[PDB]
C-alpha cells in the first residue's frame, strides 16, 4: 500500500535552512496572530499553543533519535524515559536546545524562593533576535516548545518568559517553568 | 557565474539553523489554520497566499541585500537567478524549469525537495482542495511584484496530492512601468 | 514625535487656487516651478498616534511627464481641485483618467470645487463624483476641508489595520 | 572631457548655453538653442533645489553653496556669485575640481568682455512683463563667445 | 608714489561717452526720497547715440572733444612737444605708448586700443561695431588737442583726425595731426 | 566621519533619520522630512536631464565600519565587488564643508549619509551604505510591527547603525 | 498474539487490532492491565525503562506492555511464555511507525489512527516478529 | 451498629461494619446447646412453633448484646464433606428473596457475601472427626410441670440421655441442665422443690417463666426451610435473654473453665488419651482464650485428617488474636503445610481453610501490608458451584477496591498506585456470570457500580461490547 | 581675513596708475558736466548720481571676481567689505565707519583720503549746492542694489562744503528678495 511518511526515514537529515527564512516565517506568524486576537494574553497563549504542538512532536523526535548507538533495526537500547525533574530539565538543557538552536542552553538554574519554579536562560535568543524593543510576549513560541515538551512527559506546567538583561547581554530571556504541585507530590512519593 | 555566487553566499555569508524547526513551524501554522477555517480549504489556500505575499514583499529586500545582483533583463534570467541562488540561500534547494511556453512568458518551477512539506499526509477531505506549500507561491508573486515583474503564480502538481512531482506555474503578465526613476 | 507618515497629493489645473486651500490647513510653512512639488504637512492625533499627513502640490506642462511618473507611485491619498471659472472641470475628467495609471486602486480619492467667489454647474460635479465613488466638496476659501482631510486620515489608518494590543535568585546546575 | 556649460542670471533666466556633442577640440553643438530651454529650466530647478539644501544644513560660519552635483551619468560643477550669476558646467567623471576653471571663466572672460562692455546689456531684463522668470534673452557678444570657446577647447 | 586701481579709471574713461549723450538728451526709473528723477540706462544710451539724428551727434561729439580738451590741457604734473603726447601721456592715460610714430603731417598709429578692448557687439554686426565704437576715439582726440593747446601751438592751426581701419579687436587706431 | 544617516521610502518621505555629532539638530523632524522629499524630487529631475552626447561596479572596500552580523555569517557582510543600481540618478553632493552620499535599491528605497570629510569617497560610501542596507534587511524587514513604508521604530537597528558609524567616525 | 492496542493518556485507544468469548473480553482485560502498567511506569528499574515486558496474566493470557516517551501505551494481550528480544524488537518497530504517524501536522494527539498504511505495516511487522 | 441488622441488613440503615469477620467466626464456632412429650404441644397451643428448639434457635449468637430488640451460643436439635450443593441452593433462594424484597445496594452485597462466608465456614460434616465446635456441650433438658409433667418425666429423660452413636462422643462430658417452666404461682414453689431434689440427687436447674424475629447461624438446613415463608411478647424476650445469660455465664462458662483447668492440669477415630489436648485447644478457641489454644495446637504434632485441621485452626488462632514478618514466618507457612496435608489426603482419596483465611486476612488492620495474601487465597479458590463463585469474583473486586496506598487517601500523583480498573474488570466479570445464572438485580447493581469507572471512556462504552449487551439485557 | 586678502589683491594683483591724473580726470568730467547745466547744481547732482549708479552696476562684477566673497545678509558685513576690500582695492583708501544707528539700518562712512576732491577748490557759487563726489554715492547705491541689498545713500558731510570731513550715510531700505521662477 503506498505512503510516504512511514517509508521516509526519520534519522537526522543534517541539512540546514537560512536563519532569515525562518525569521521571516516567524515574523508573519506573529503578524497574522496580531491581526486576529484582541489582547496580549490571547495572542501569547495562541503562540504558546503553536509551540505546544511543536514540542509534543519534538519530545518523541529527540528521545527516539538519541536511542541509536527503519531506525528500530539499529536500536539496541532506548533512552530512559525521563521521570525525575532534574533529568528531563538536563535533557532540555543539553539536547533540546543543542538540537533546536545548535548550542547548549546557557545554564540551568533551579529557583530558591519558590521550589517548583525552574529557570532556563538564553543569552542571545536565536529565533526572536529581530523583534524590536523588549516586548517579551513575542517569544512565547519558545515557551510553548517547552510546555508541550514537558506536558507529554507527565509534567503539567505554566511556562512563561521574562526579560532580565544582565552581564552585557541586552537580550537575555529567562523562561521559567512552573511545575504543577502534583508533579512535586509525585517527586515526593517516589524517590 | 550565478552558481558560484549563490553557493558561496549560502555557504559562508548566511546563518544556518536546523531545517526540521522550519518545516515543523510551517506545519504547525498550516495545521492550526486548517482547523480554524472549518476545513474550508479554498479559504485556507487564499489565506496562505496572502501570507506568502506578505513574506515575499519583505524577503525581496533581504535577497537583494545579500546577493546584490543587477537588474533582470529577461524572464529566463529571472528563472535562473531564482532556481540557482534564491532557493539555494533561503530553503537551500535547487528547483528547475521544464515548461517554457511560447513567448517564454510562462515557466514551471520544479520543487524536487520541498522542505516545507516533510512528514505531511493530508486529511481525506483536503486531498483534492488544499495546496500545502501555497505560502511558497504567494512569496514568489509578492517578491516578483516588488521587482515590477508582475506574475500570476499557482500550483499544478503536488506530491502531497499524490502527483509524481510538485510544480509551480509562474506566468508573467506585464512588466510594470512604475520602475524606479534611475 | 511622529510615528506614522501618510502621503497625500493635491493636484489640478494650473490656474486653480490650490495654495489657498493648503495654507490654512498647513503647518507653520519655493520648490514649485523648479522641481514641480510644493510640500505641506499637518500633524494629527489618530487613535493616540501622532500621524503626519504630507501633502504634495504639483503642476506644469513643461514638467508633466516627470510629475506623473514618480510622485504618484506610493500615494496614500489623492485630491483633485478645480476652480469655479469650466475648463478646469473638463480637465478633471482627463485628470481622473490619468491618476489610475500610476496610483493603485485602493488609494482614497477626493474631489473639490474651489474659489466660489458660480460660473460652472453644480449637479454635474455631484453626479460625476458619484460615478467614480468620489467624496466631493463645493467650498471656497477655513471651509471644513480640514474635516474631510482628517476623515481621510482616519480611513487610511483604518486600512492599515494594526491592532494595538520572580526574583529568580536561583542556583546553577552546572 | 566637458559635456556642456551654462550661465544663468539672478532673474531666473538662462542667458548662455553651450552643448558640446562630438567631443572634438572644436566640437559642433548648440549655442543658445531654443531646444535646450526646457532642459535649461530643469537644470536650473535641480541646482536651485540643491542650493536650498546647502542653505539649510549650514554650520553657522557662512551661508555656504554647492560645489559638485554628481549623478550616476555625469558630474556637475557650479561657481555661484554674490550678484546671483550661476556658472554651471557639466562634465564626465574624469576631472573633479573645476573651481579654478570656473573662477578664470568668470574673472577674465565674463568680467573682461561683458561687464566692461557698454554695448552689452547687463542684467538682460527688459521689463516686468518677462522679468519674473520668463523671457529668453541671451548673451551673444562676439568677443565673449570667441574667447570662451578658444579657452575651453582643450578640455573637450 | 601716487597709486589707484586701473579698471575704475579705464571704465570711467569709457563712461564719459554716456555722459555726453545723456547731457545732450536731457537738455531737451530709479528714485530717492527727494528725487523721483527720470533716468536712462547706459547701453540704450549708446544705441541711441548711434541711432541719434546727425546735428545732435555733432553736438555730442563736440562735447566729448571739449571733455578730452580739459583732460589733456593740464598734463604738466609728472616730472618734440607733439611727441609729448606719444612718449608717456599714453603710458598714463592708456599704458601703451603709440607703436608707430611718424612725421612729414604727423601720423600716430596704435594697435589694441585699451578702453574699447571689450566692446564687440553681436557677431553679425561688425560694421555697426565700428560705427558704434567710433565716438570713444574722441577722448584721445580731445586729449591730443588740449595737450597741444597752450603748449606753444595754436589750437586752430592743427585739426586732429582719428579713425580705425588699420591692421580680439585688432582694428587699431590712427591719428593725423598738423 | 559621518554626522547623519537617513533613509527614504518609495512613496517619497523620510522614514528614519539620526545624527551622530554633538547637537546638529538645528532642523525640525518636519524639516528633515521636507529635505528628504526634495531629495526625491531632485532625483526625479536629475535623471530626466541627461547630456545630449549620452542620449560600472563598486570595488569592495575591506572593512568599512567593521571590527554575529544579524543573519549574516563572516566577520564582514560580503567579500566581492558589486554593481550600482541607480545608473543616471543623483549620486554625490559635495559642499564647502560636507559631502552627501546617496545609495539606491532596485525596490525604490533610498539611503543617504552626510559625511564631513570635505571617486574613492563614493566607493567607500556605497560600501558603507550597503552595510546599512544589510542592517535594514535584518532589523526592519524581520519585524511584524513595522508597516511597510511608515517610519522605523527599531532599537536594534539604531544600535547597529550607531555601532557602525562609531567604527567609521 | 491475541490482541494489540495503543492507548493515550486520556485512556482511550488511539488504535486497536484484533489478531487472527475472549474476542469480546479482550479490551477489558487490557484496560484492567493499564493500572499495573502505570504502576511500573514511574519506577526506576521497573537498562531501558520503556520495555516493561510482561505485566499481568488473566487465565494465562500474559499481557505485555511498553511505554512511549509521550505517555502513549503500546500494550498487547499475548496468547504461554514470551521471548524478550523479539517482543522488544516488535515494540521498537511499532513505536517508530507511531512516531512517524505523530509527525503529521494535521494529527491530533487524541485522534484515532486511521491510515491503512499503518495498519498493514504493523500487521506485517507482527508477522515478521511474532508469528 | 446493631450486629443483628448487618447479618440481616436486608430487614435503610447503611453504615460500615466494625471487625465483622471475627464476630462471624466466633458466632459459628460457639458452643452448641441442644433443646428437647406434651411440651411442644403446649408451645403449639401458646406460640405457633412446632417445637421448643426453633423458639430458642431464635435466640442465637451473643447473649449479652440482647440480639432481639461478649460470648456467643448456637442451638441445635436434640442429640441424634463440603456439601456445597446446599450452599448453592441457599444462595439461589436467598437471591430470589432479595429480588422479591428490594434502594442502595452499597451494603447489601457486603452483607450477602458475609452470610455466604458464614455458611461456608459451617459447611463440613456436622459431627467432624476433629472439629468439636459442632458437638453439643450443654444438653438443655426442658420440662413444664405446669402443664402436668412430673419428676419421673425428668428422670426418664435424663436416663435416655445417658448412652449408631459415634466413638468420640462421651455423654459424661456434656453438662446437662434442667429447664423447668411455669405459667404464673404455687407451680413456681413446687418447681423450686423439684429443683432442690434434682440438685441434691442428680445436675442443675433453671426456672423459666411462661416484636418480630430475624434469626441467624442455626445451620445449613434450617435456613432453606426459613426461606419458604412471627411475633412474641417483649417481656418474654427479656425473660428468655436473662435466663440464657444466667445459663451461659453461671452454669456453662464456669463448667467450661473447670473443664479447661482439669485438661491443662492433665496435659503437662479416637475418643480419649489424645482427645484431651485437642478438645482443650478447641474450647480455648471457643472462649477466645487464643494463645493457650495456639500453644496446645503447636504441641499437637502427631494422620490424614486431624493434623491438617489442627494446623489450620492454629493459623486461625493466630489470625483471630499481626505484622508482615510473622505472616512471612508463621501464618502463611502454616497454611501451606495445611495445604500439603490436604493434597496428601486427596492423594489418599481445603475450601473451608481458604475461605476462612481469606476473610481473616481481609479483617486485619493493615490493609495494604497483607490484603495481597487474601487476594492470593481467593484466587486460589477460583481454580465449588457457579453461583457461589460469582460471589467470590465480587469479593476479589472488593479486595482490589482496597489496594490504594494510604498515603493519598489531572491526578498525576494517584495514577500509578490505585488499582480501581482491576476492581471494575472483576465487577464486570461478576456481572457477566450473574447474567449467565440469570439474576437481573445483581447485574443491575454491578453495572451501577461499574458506571463510575467505565463512563468516562467511550471506546469501551460503545455498542458491540458486553457493557452494551448487558445494559440491553436488562430489558 | 578681509584685511590681508584686500592688501594681497591690491599690492600683488592690481597694477599702478597716477592718482593726480584721476583727480584731473574727475575735475574735467564735473567741470564740463556743470558747464552745459547753466550752473544749476541740483540737476548736476541728479545726473552724477545716475552716472554713479551705472558705474557701480558694471564695476561690481569685476569686484566680485577680484575677490571671492559670498553675499552678505547683515549690514555689518557690508561695512567690513566696503572699508577693508572694496575701497582699498579700487582706489586704495580705508575709510572708517561710525555713527552706527539703532537696528543697524544706517552707518556713516568717513573718507578722509577721498582723491576725487583732493586739490580741487570750489567757487562760492559751486559750494552752495554741488556734491563733488556724488558719483561715489551713486556707485554705492548701484553696487549694493546689485547684491540684493536695496539701499539709499547720500552725503552727510563734505570738506569742500566747509563740513567737518567727507562722510556719507549708507542707509538700508530693504534687503531684496531672491526671486524664483513661475
Ligand atoms: C531580478 O530582478 C531579480 C529578482 C528576483 C527575486 C527572487 C525572490 C526569491 C524568492 C525565493 C523564495 C523564498 C521562500 C522562503 C520564504 C518563506
Ligand atoms: C555683501 O556681500 C556686499 C558685497 C560686497 C560690497 C560691494 C560694494 C562695491 C562698491 C565699491 C565702490 C568703490 C568706489 C570706486 C570709485 C568710483
Author numbering:
A (entry chain J): 41 to 109, 161 to 282
B (entry chain I), I (entry chain F): 9 to 190
C (entry chain A): 4 to 32, 36 to 91, 93 to 124, 129 to 152, 155 to 178, 191 to 199
D (entry chain G): 2 to 157
E (entry chain E): 37 to 64, 88 to 138, 155 to 179, 183 to 245, 253 to 263
F (entry chain H): 2 to 56, 65 to 76, 97 to 147, 169 to 218, 220
G (entry chain K): 2 to 21, 32 to 57, 84 to 116, 123 to 174
H (entry chain B): 3 to 13, 18 to 42, 45 to 77, 130 to 140, 152 to 173, 177 to 237, 244 to 264, 267 to 284, ...
Question: How do the authors describe this structure?
Answer:
The GTPase Rab1 is a master regulator of the early secretory pathway and is critical for autophagy. Rab1 activation is controlled by its guanine nucleotide exchange factor, the multisubunit TRAPPIII complex. While the TRAPPII and TRAPPIII complexes share a core set of subunits, the distinguishing feature of the TRAPPIII complex is the presence of the Trs85 subunit (TRAPPC8 in metazoans). Our results show that the Trs85 subunit serves as a membrane anchor, via its amphipathic helix, for the entire TRAPPIII complex.
Here, we report the high‐resolution structure of the intact yeast TRAPPIII complex bound to its substrate GTPase Rab1/Ypt1, representing the key intermediate of the nucleotide exchange reaction. Although these data were of lower quality due to the higher tilt angle, combination of data from the three tilt angles provided sufficient orientation coverage to generate a 3.7 Å reconstruction suitable for de novo model building from 69,315 particles (EV2C–G and EV3). The TRAPPIII complex adopts a narrow rod‐like structure, in agreement with the published negative‐stain EM structure. The cryo‐EM structure reveals that the N‐terminal portion of Trs85 adopts a GTPase‐like fold and the C‐terminal portion folds into a twisting α‐solenoid comprising five pairs of α‐helices. The GTPase‐like fold in Trs85 has multiple insertions relative to a typical GTPase protein and does not appear capable of binding nucleotide. There are two interfaces between Trs85 and the TRAPP core subunits: an extensive interaction between Trs85 and Trs20, involving 31 residues and encompassing a total surface area of roughly 2,250 Å, and a much smaller interaction between Trs31 and part of a largely unstructured loop of Trs85. The interface between Trs85 and Trs20 is quite conserved and involves Trs20 Asp46, a residue known to be important for assembly of both the TRAPPII and TRAPPIII complexes that is mutated in spondyloepiphyseal dysplasia tarda (SEDT). Some small differences were noted; for example, we observed covalently bound palmitate molecules in both Bet3 subunits, whereas only one of the Bet3 subunits appeared to be bound to palmitate in the previous structure of the catalytic core. In our cryo‐EM reconstruction of the TRAPPIII‐GTPase complex, we observed a region of strong but unexpected density on the surface of the complex that we have confidently assigned as corresponding to a portion of the Rab1/Ypt1 HVD (and EV4H).
